[PDB]
Design a protein around this ligand. Structure first.
Ligand SMILES: [Zn+2]
Ligand SMILES: [Zn+2]
Lengths: 476, 126, 153
């Protein structure tokens, strides 16, 4: 049955192939089924023969093409073929998808819409063709009226977004919007649907989902992706703390999320700016409820980029300062203590972050070290070489101390450098108070000396300055 | 010799964890006048399995990757941070396995990845 | 090396306490490959047949998967004429599910399971798969014919 069509196609088009096409009208289904059963190259040859012998200038071939399109759509998912044949079919269809009018492609769009909504799509590979169809619709100036092809595209995509998706098939849904030419509200509704889909997901599924959400965020749609991820993980960690009132898994997630957000802002020097602008509590100075452990962890994994580093580390500092100012006013006043519910402070946030940092959070510690030392250097006692001036500064250095303490307790690759930094700031200055550093050091050594048999030589060489150092400090 | 020798543990991130925590808060109680074993029994606050099974294979102490003991003299030391697995592994076999794996992300000198038996987070420091 | 580590234990293990209806020895012709024999599972058309298989151990095997083939051919949806095994456990990560917690006995148990329960989702033989999907007795008939023709003495 095939070799006749091969011989008809061997020489010329639409003079004998059409004539034979008007002989065999039905049975293309079973024909293609035995075709894929025996050999798929024959199916490809038939498809080439069909699309050359069924041009769409004449409208009879358009319906043969629509029938065989639906045939391939159903079989490629349901009928488990070989892989190479499937790829070939998809490539051929994506090739010949351009030679159509508006409404035929609109009804193919509605086919796929109803199918992904309700049709248990066995493999979903057919969706690869869909964005080609949306492209052909956008570009085809054969105007419709229900109106332009791009506007019917807007309609169909608004339909799809407002509609329900599959749990399994959101990956591929957003993978399609990956390569489309979209506008602001297009990409907005795409990400909003994929966003609200988060509440019906296993957690091993979220990382590549957010990866693709962000590479699509690259178009214009940056702010809302991060704001939603933030609110999601905020409520998540609150719910997990209330459960405590899969912790290791939850940590493992948050880490790879932040890793992929790092690559993102690495590639986009603006993403971090909106991130910052979204987060900065000092709009005037009042505490926003935007920040969180995970939020902060993201910031500290970010600060190891060369541009935002100092910006972030200033922000966090001033925010902690405000935290403590409002807190000391609260505890100072009954009247306000009557009104406001206690809010998870920045300090305690950081401490819990450190607790979570134990697992695999290597990217965070490098900034935590700097952060603690920065607090201490910034607000260390310098005046004697008052609560409003001193409590913040003291609590600040105290917090830096707690950070470095609980850090040094558990992290085995930033020791020697916590250590030598303390020693460096201690030894040379020899003028400004370092009692804070020293008491810190005392606590450190006391808790866990045996580690310092490994961290040895810095102290042996630190003794070399002992002949030059001042006496009282040497005694301590 | 009775002075504190330099030491560390090999094993699990939940068994080795509180062992060092006791040691940190009892090393100050190290009385070098006693025997070392006697000092340990109170510093660590435990008794040893004093040859309690020594060299008798109950299949407990085995790599699970190479299924061997003393792989090139290398001991099953790396374990799972899991009550249910507690599957101990070598260094080299666990390294080479978590080498090809896609999820296996590499920090400075760390490889993270899933325990082969239980698919739980396991950390390897080279 | 770890190859031989796995191999020396799995040899004695599959010689003494193999899985049920499965046996395996060092292939007396090869001495690097292994000769396995899966006895025809009950409630199958493959009964009255001792299906021989060749088992290849790659050199990095606890890390690689094995490579099995049906030397005694089988009329199966998922096993082709040659005896290939389109099974995830013989495939690497996310494509497949191989890890050293599995081994020769586990994958042979999986193959024995497949011989009783063909996979309609991952077919090497799409036509035998459609036959097993719709026309059960024709598939079972052709499989029992295939068994008594080749697998029987
Ligand atoms: Zn080993
Ligand atoms: Zn485990």
């Amino acid at each position: 049955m095939d070799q006749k069509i091969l011989s008809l196609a061997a020489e010329k088009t639409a003079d004998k192939l059409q004539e034979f096409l008007q002989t065999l009208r039905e049975g293309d289904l079973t024909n293609l089924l035995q075709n894929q059963a025996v050999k798929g190259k024959v199916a490809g040859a038939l498809l080439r023969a069909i699309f050359k012998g069924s041009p769409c200038s004449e409208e009879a071939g358009t319906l043969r093409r629509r029938k065989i399109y639906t045939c391939c759509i159903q079989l490629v998912e349901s009928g488990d073929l070989q892989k190479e044949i499937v790829s070939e079919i998809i490539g051929l269809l994506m090739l010949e998808a351009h030679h159509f009018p508006g409404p035929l492609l609109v009804e193919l769009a509605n086919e796929f819409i109803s199918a992904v909504r309700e049709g248990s799509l066995v493999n979903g590979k057919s969706l690869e063709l869909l964005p080609i169809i949306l492209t052909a619709l956008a570009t085809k100036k054969e105007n419709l009226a229900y109106l332009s092809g791009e506007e019917c595209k807007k309609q169909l995509i608004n339909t799809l977004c407002s509609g329900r998706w599959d749990q399994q098939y959101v990956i591929q849904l957003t993978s399609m919007f990956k390569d489309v030419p979209l506008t602001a509200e297009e990409v907005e509704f795409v990400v909003e649907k994929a966003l609200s889909m988060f509440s019906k997901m296993n957690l091993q599924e979220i990382p590549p989902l957010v990866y693709q959400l962000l590479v699509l965020s690259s178009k214009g749609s940056r702010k809302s992706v991060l704001e939603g991820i933030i609110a999601f993980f905020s409520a998540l960690d609150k719910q997990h703390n209330e459960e405590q009132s899969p912790s290791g898994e939850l940590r493992h997630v948050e880490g790879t999320i932040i890793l992929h957000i790092v690559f993102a802002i690495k590639l986009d020097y603006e993403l971090g700016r909106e991130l910052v602008k979204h987060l900065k509590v000092g709009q005037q100075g009042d505490s926003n409820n935007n920040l969180s452990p995970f939020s902060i962890a993201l910031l500290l994994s970010v600060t190891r980029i060369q541009r935002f580093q100092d910006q972030v580390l200033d922000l966090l500092k001033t925010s902690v300062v405000k935290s403590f100012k409002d807190l000391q006013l609260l505890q100072g006043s009954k009247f306000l203590q009557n009104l406001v519910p206690h809010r998870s402070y920045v300090s305690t946030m950081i401490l819990e972050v450190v607790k979570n940092s134990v697992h695999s959070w290597d990217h965070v510690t490098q900034g935590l070290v700097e952060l603690g030392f920065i607090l201490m250097d910034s607000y260390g006692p310098k005046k004697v070489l008052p609560s409003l001036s001193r409590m913040p500064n003291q609590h600040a250095c105290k917090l830096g101390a707690n950070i470095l303490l609980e850090t040094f307790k558990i992290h085995e690759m930033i020791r020697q450098e916590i250590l030598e930094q303390v020693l460096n700031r201690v030894v040379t200055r020899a003028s400004s108070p370092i009692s804070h550093f020293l008491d810190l050091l005392s606590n450190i050594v006391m808790y866990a000396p045996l580690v310092l048999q490994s961290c040895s030589s810095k102290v042996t060489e630190a003794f070399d300055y002992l002949s030059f150092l001042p006496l009282q400090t040497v005694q301590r | 010799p009775t002075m504190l020798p330099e030491c560390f543990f090999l094993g699990a991130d939940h068994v080795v964890k509180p062992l060092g925590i006791k040691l940190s808060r009892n090393i100050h109680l190290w009385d070098p006048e006693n025997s070392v074993l006697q000092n340990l029994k109170d510093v660590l606050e435990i008794d040893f399995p004093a040859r309690a099974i020594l060299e008798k294979s109950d299949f407990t102490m085995d790599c699970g990757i190479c299924y061997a003991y003393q792989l090139d003299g290398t001991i099953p030391d790396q374990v799972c941070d899991n009550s249910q697995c507690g599957q101990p592994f070598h260094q080299i076999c666990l390294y080479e396995w978590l080498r090809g794996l896609l999820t296996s992300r590499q920090s400075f000198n760390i490889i993270f990845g899933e325990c082969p038996y239980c698919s739980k987070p396991i950390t390897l420091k080279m | 090396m770890q190859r031989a580590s796995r191999l020396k234990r799995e040899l004695h293990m599959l010689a003494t306490e193999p899985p049920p209806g499965i046996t395996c020895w060092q292939d007396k012709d090869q001495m690097d490959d292994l000769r396995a024999q899966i006895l025809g599972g009950a409630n199958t058309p493959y009964e009255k047949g001792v299906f021989k298989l060749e088992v290849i151990i790659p050199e990095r095997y606890p890390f690689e998967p094995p490579q099995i083939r049906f030397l005694t051919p089988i009329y199966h949806p998922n096993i082709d004429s040659a005896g290939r095994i389109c099974l995830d456990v013989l495939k690497l990560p996310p494509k497949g599910a191989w890890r050293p917690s599995l081994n020769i006995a586990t994958v042979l148990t999986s193959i024995q399971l497949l011989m009783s329960e063909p996979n309609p989702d991952d077919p090497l033989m799409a036509d035998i798969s459609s036959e097993f999907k719709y026309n059960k007795p024709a598939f079972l008939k052709n499989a029992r014919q295939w068994t008594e023709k080749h697998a029987r003495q």
